[PDB]
Structures are given as C-alpha cells and as structure tokens.
Amino acid sequence: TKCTLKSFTVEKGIYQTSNFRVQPTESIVRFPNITNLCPFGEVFNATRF
Amino acid sequence: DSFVIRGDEVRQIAPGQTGKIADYNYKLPDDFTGCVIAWNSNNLDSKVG
Amino acid sequence: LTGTGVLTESNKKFLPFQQFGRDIADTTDAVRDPQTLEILDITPCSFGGVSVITPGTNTSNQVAVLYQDVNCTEVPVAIHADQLTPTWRVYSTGSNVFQTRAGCLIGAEHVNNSYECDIPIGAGICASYQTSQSIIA
Amino acid sequence: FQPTNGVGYQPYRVVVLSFELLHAPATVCGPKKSTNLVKNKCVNFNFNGLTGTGVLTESNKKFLPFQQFGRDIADTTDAVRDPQTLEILDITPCSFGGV
Amino acid sequence: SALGKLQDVVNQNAQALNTLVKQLSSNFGAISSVLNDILSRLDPPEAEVQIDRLITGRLQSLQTYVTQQLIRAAEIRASANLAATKMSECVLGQSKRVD
Amino acid sequence: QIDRLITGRLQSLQTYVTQQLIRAAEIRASANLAATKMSECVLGQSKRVD
Amino acid sequence: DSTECSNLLLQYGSFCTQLNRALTGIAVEQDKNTQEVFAQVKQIYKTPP
Amino acid sequence: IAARDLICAQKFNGLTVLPPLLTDEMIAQYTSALLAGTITSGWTFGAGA
Amino acid sequence: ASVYAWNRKRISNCVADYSVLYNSASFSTFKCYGVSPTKLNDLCFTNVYA
Numbered sequence A: 001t002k003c004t005l006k007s008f009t010v011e012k013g014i015y016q017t018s019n020f021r022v023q024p025t026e027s028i029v030r031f032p033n034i035t036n037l038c039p040f041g042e043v044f045n046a047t048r049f
Numbered sequence B: 001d002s003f004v005i006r007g008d009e010v011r012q013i014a015p016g017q018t019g020k021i022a023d024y025n026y027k028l029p030d031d032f033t034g035c036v037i038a039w040n041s042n043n044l045d046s047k048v049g
Numbered sequence C: 001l002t003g004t005g006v007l008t009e010s011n012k013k014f015l016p017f018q019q020f021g022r023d024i025a026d027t028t029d030a031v032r033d034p035q036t037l038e039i040l041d042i043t044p045c046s047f048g049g050v051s052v053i054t055p056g057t058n059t060s061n062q063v064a065v066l067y068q069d070v071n072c073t074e075v076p077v078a079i080h081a082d083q084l085t086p087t088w089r090v091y092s093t094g095s096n097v098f099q100t101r102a103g104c105l106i107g108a109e110h111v112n113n114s115y116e117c118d119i120p121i122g123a124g125i126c127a128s129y130q131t132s133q134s135i136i137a
Numbered sequence D: 001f002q003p004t005n006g007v008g009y010q011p012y013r014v015v016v017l018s019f020e021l022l023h024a025p026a027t028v029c030g031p032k033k034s035t036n037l038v039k040n041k042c043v044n045f046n047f048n049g050l051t052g053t054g055v056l057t058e059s060n061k062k063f064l065p066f067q068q069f070g071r072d073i074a075d076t077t078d079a080v081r082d083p084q085t086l087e088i089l090d091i092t093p094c095s096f097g098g099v
Numbered sequence E: 001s002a003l004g005k006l007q008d009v010v011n012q013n014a015q016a017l018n019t020l021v022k023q024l025s026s027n028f029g030a031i032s033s034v035l036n037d038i039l040s041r042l043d044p045p046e047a048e049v050q051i052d053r054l055i056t057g058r059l060q061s062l063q064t065y066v067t068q069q070l071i072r073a074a075e076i077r078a079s080a081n082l083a084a085t086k087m088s089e090c091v092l093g094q095s096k097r098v099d
Numbered sequence F: 001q002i003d004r005l006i007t008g009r010l011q012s013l014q015t016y017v018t019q020q021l022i023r024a025a026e027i028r029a030s031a032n033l034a035a036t037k038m039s040e041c042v043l044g045q046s047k048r049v050d
Numbered sequence G: 001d002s003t004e005c006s007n008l009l010l011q012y013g014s015f016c017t018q019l020n021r022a023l024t025g026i027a028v029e030q031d032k033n034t035q036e037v038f039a040q041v042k043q044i045y046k047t048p049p
Numbered sequence H: 001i002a003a004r005d006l007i008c009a010q011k012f013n014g015l016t017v018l019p020p021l022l023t024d025e026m027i028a029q030y031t032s033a034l035l036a037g038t039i040t041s042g043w044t045f046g047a048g049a
Numbered sequence I: 001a002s003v004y005a006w007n008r009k010r011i012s013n014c015v016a017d018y019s020v021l022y023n024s025a026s027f028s029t030f031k032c033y034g035v036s037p038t039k040l041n042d043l044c045f046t047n048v049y050a
C-alpha cells in the first residue's frame, strides 16, 4: 500500500494495490523436437548464385 | 551543391554531423530536406603522381 | 513467444493452421505447446485483485486483505503463496478468514454483532479498528 | 593480416570512448572557454555541460563530495555545484508566469 | 475528531498533488526525466522526439490530475448544494422534512 | 513500441474514465431527484405540482 | 504477461493509479447515491401483519 | 451477477466489477422498513420514536 | 591490443579536444550513441574509458 500510494503514511480505509509480491525465479524454454541443422552451407556456400 | 572529398569524409555530409568538413568546409542544417549523392571517382579526379 | 505468467490446461480446440490464440487481441490467452500437442492457456501471474483494509499508520501497522472475487479455499493457489515471502504467508491463510460475496477477507476478526460502517469492504461487509486492539469485520 | 588483402579483410583500429553524462562531478571537459558568473540575473548558463536558461541564487544546501547536481522532484535541476568556486548555487526558472 | 469530512478534503487534495508530482518524476520513455539533459546531450533534430515524449507525458499527467479535480469538484458541489439548501430551508426558515 | 502501446492503452482508459464521469453525473442527478422525492413525498407530503 | 513487469510498473504505474483512484471515487459516489436514496431513516420496523 | 469469477478480469484485460456496498436484500429491507413505518405512522416515522 | 583482450584506459583531468585529430587521422567510422557529435564540445564527462 505504501509503494502504491508513494507515501510512508497511509490513512484509514481500503486501498487497491498493484502487484509487487511475486518475482519469477525459473525460466522454461519449449521448442519443437527438431534435430537436424539448417542447410546454410547450400544457401551461402553455393558454387554459383 | 557539388564538391569533391575523400571517402572517410563522405560520412560527414549529413545533418547533425561533426568533423573537419562539417565544421570548416561544408555544413548542412539540422532541418535539411534534400538528398546527398556521392560516388567514387578514382578514375577521373586522381592522377599518377 | 516470451513472457511471464502461469499456465493451465485448456478445453479450447485449435485448427491445424492455428498456433496462438487472442480472444482480447492484446494478450495471448492460449497457446499450443510445441512438443506435446496439448493446448495450454496462459493466465497472467499478476493477482492485482487484492485490496488492503488498513487503519491509519499513525494508529496501527496491522492490516487485512480482501482478495476480490475468489473463494477462500483457492486463496493460496490464486496468489501463489508458495513463491511469496513468509510475511505474505500470514495473510494467505489462518484463523481470521471470512468468506464474503465481495471476496475472501483474511486478517480481520468476524463478529456476529453489527455496527455502523466506517471502512466499506463491500457486499454488506464493513471493517473497523475496535477492541486487545484489533481489526474487526 | 596482409597488405594485399581486401578492404573487409584489412586492419581496422577501434577506440570506443565510454562516457557518463551529467550525473557525477566531472574531471574531463570540452574545448569551450569558461566565462564569468552572473548571479541573481536571468542568463543562459552552462555548468559542466548542463545548459539552461534561468536565474541563480545562493543556496544553503550541503552536497556530499560525490554529488554534483540537485533535484527535489527529478524533472528540474534545482542546485548545482559551481565548478570553479565550490559554492552551491540553486537555479530558479527565469519565467515568472505567476501573473 | 468528528470533523472527518473537512480533513478528508485536505487529505484528498494533498494526495492528488503528491500523485501529480510523482507522475512528474517519470521519464516517460526518454533518456532523462529532466529537459536540460536532453537539450545538453542531443542536437534538436533527434532531441525533438525526446522533448515531445517528455512534454506529452507531463501534459497527460496534468490531464489526469484535472479529471481527478472534476471528480472532487463534483463531490464538493454536491455537498455545497446540500449545505446551501439546508442554509436556505433551516437556518433562514423552518423545514417540515424529517431528518 | 512499448511506450506507444502503453500510452495508447492509458489514453483509451482515460477516455473510458471521462465517459464514466458523464454517466456518473447523469446518475448523480437522477439519484438526487430520487432522494429529494424520497424525503419530500415518501417521508412527507409535498405541495409541489407534478 | 510481459517478461518485464516491474520496469513497466515503475514507468507507467502512477498514471493507472490516478485513473483507478478516479474510478474508485466514481464507485464510492455510486455507493453514496444508494445510501442517500435508501438510508435516509436508519430505523428498521418489522412488517406488521 | 454476484457470481462473477477471477477468469472474467483476465478476459477484460484488467477491468473488474466491484459489487455494491448495499446488498439487494439490505436495500429491500430499507424499502420494507420505510413502507412499514410510513403506513403505521406517517410523519412521525422520521422524527424518532 | 587484440580484440579478445582489449585495452581499457582511463581518461581524466584533461580537456577533451577532438579537433587536434583532424590533421593526422581520418576516421572511417565515428558513431556516438546517447550523445550528439555536435554537442560533444560543450559537455563535461565524469569518467571516460577508452
């Protein structure tokens, strides 16, 4: 409430407070099951363009 | 506005730029509306010796 | 697609050419997981539907919290009390838990006798600082 | 590196000058020549690169040795430490729009 | 303190002014929250975007303060209409209405 | 881009707030009329016509 | 569900806080309207047969 | 509807509907008290006792 | 120095006049981020690292 109101003293009543309580600690990455590498050797190292 | 510079100074023909050309030789205004065109002329301007 | 939030299982059905979902068109509510073809819907991690009922800081430093539009049994799930500091786990559950139609109020003692309203909680429920000395609802 | 290499394979010397602007007392400055201080008058001023227009008064504030600028509300620089004389001068806007 | 309706006016006005001066401290997506740094570090062709962002943010904050003032003025106008009606009907005469 | 998007959302919310001000003014006028009729006609007798 | 929420809150939170205070004032005004219409006499009389 | 749940706020991108302070049961009881007092007493209902 | 072990040098207590570099060295690349090159003369820097 103090951080929402930007004051160290709050008055009597009910105050709607924005979220400051939860911070993410872990990260997950989900990609498709892809194994082979892209043929950039064919695109970039072709003998003729 | 036509002139001849060297290559390393072609970057100085721009609004808001500094350098030797942009300070002492040729300066463009900040509110400049127009097109800067530059091309290499080693075959014409430069000569042997 | 990077973000921060919580995921639940969804009953939505995706067409084979569809990957993301946007019912509100400014937030991706649903997504198709790439490895397993189940559809997971994404709820924001932020639970800002909480209102702090307090007296004056000059008077006291103890508060009550009204979690809006949630059931009292789902308060630890909704606010993610496992990932919170232990000081917020005091207001996650306890003896002073009251289920109102406005929400779940934790931190205030329910009394059967009724008085006039000074701090309007809502749905006919009010709060006050009355006697040791504590917040009553 | 070889002298017969291409332009993209030729040596290029790079110097990256990293600065920090208008946050701490400054030890390195530009070629601009300093002038006199006009107190209690509306004047264009340039203190350690900080340019502005306004009037200056003497201030009773005290600065820590690592502090150079002063902001009560953080959208206008109240007080500055004058670089030559170590007195602290607070800056009032020249505009008296309260009329 | 049974005079909780008059202290609330002062508290609400002070809370609105705080909120305004807290919005004024934001940089509104610019390199600095003070105009002097933008004028000192950037030439006007690319400083104008930063100037527009900062001034637009300040003006929108002032607009929200104005709308809060309309709400407070509407509540105070309702209270003042009630006070004027009670002055005209009960101080200056007798009222047959109950409560 | 984030500044543009968030500023646009905040301006849209501000227009919603102003629409709520107009609606609240109309509802406040209707509620003042209802309270006056409650105090003058339910709780007593009124000599005013219509 | 942005990956950075605290930075966005620090840059744009007081604006929404002022707007939410405006909406809360409107809601409180609606509650006062209901109270001034229905709760003029705070005496409860049982319904007679 | 007095039954709206948390899943609604996510749908509206933040916007929530606050319930009124006076329940329709409490408004109906105010109305019933006003009716009973009016029919029983008349002008003396608001005067106390 | 090499690019894997680049040489960082502190510049302090002096006057940053780049106009002395006009005669000798011609810079193919000169890009200033967070500051304009025209406003570089009328500015004072706290710490400078090359």
Ligand SMILES: *[C@@H]1O[C@H](CO)[C@@H](O)[C@H](O)[C@H]1NC(C)=O
Pocket (backbone or CB within 6 Å): A041, A045
């Ligand atoms: C490209 O082809 C040349 C010629 O065979 C070879 O020397 C070089 O290693 C190739 N580069 C890549 C990235 O495959």
Ligand SMILES: *[C@@H]1O[C@H](CO)[C@@H](O)[C@H](O)[C@H]1NC(C)=O
Pocket (backbone or CB within 6 Å): A033, C035, C036
């Ligand atoms: C993806 O690969 C992992 C690793 O072998 C496997 O466990 C998983 O079942 C695979 N998923 C699909 C959908 O094939």
Ligand SMILES: *[C@@H]1O[C@H](CO)[C@@H](O)[C@H](O)[C@H]1NC(C)=O
Pocket (backbone or CB within 6 Å): C057, C058, C059
């Ligand atoms: C509360 O306010 C009064 C003045 O109204 C002051 O004398 C007292 O010291 C304050 N107490 C606290 C704990 O702030």
Ligand SMILES: *[C@@H]1O[C@H](CO)[C@@H](O)[C@H](O)[C@H]1NC(C)=O
Pocket (backbone or CB within 6 Å): C071, C072, C073
């Ligand atoms: C909350 O959960 C309890 C558990 O049985 C249930 O009885 C009650 O009806 C629930 N309340 C709501 C509003 O869903």
Ligand SMILES: *[C@@H]1O[C@H](CO)[C@@H](O)[C@H](O)[C@H]1NC(C)=O
Pocket (backbone or CB within 6 Å): C112
């Ligand atoms: C309040 O009423 C409930 C109804 O079940 C009862 O269990 C409780 O003991 C009562 N408390 C007091 C203090 O009367």
Ligand SMILES: *[C@@H]1O[C@H](CO)[C@@H](O)[C@H](O)[C@H]1NC(C)=O
Pocket (backbone or CB within 6 Å): D083, D084, D085
């Ligand atoms: C700076 O140098 C000038 C010229 O010698 C002198 O008058 C002035 O007092 C000096 N300021 C200092 C040492 O702070």
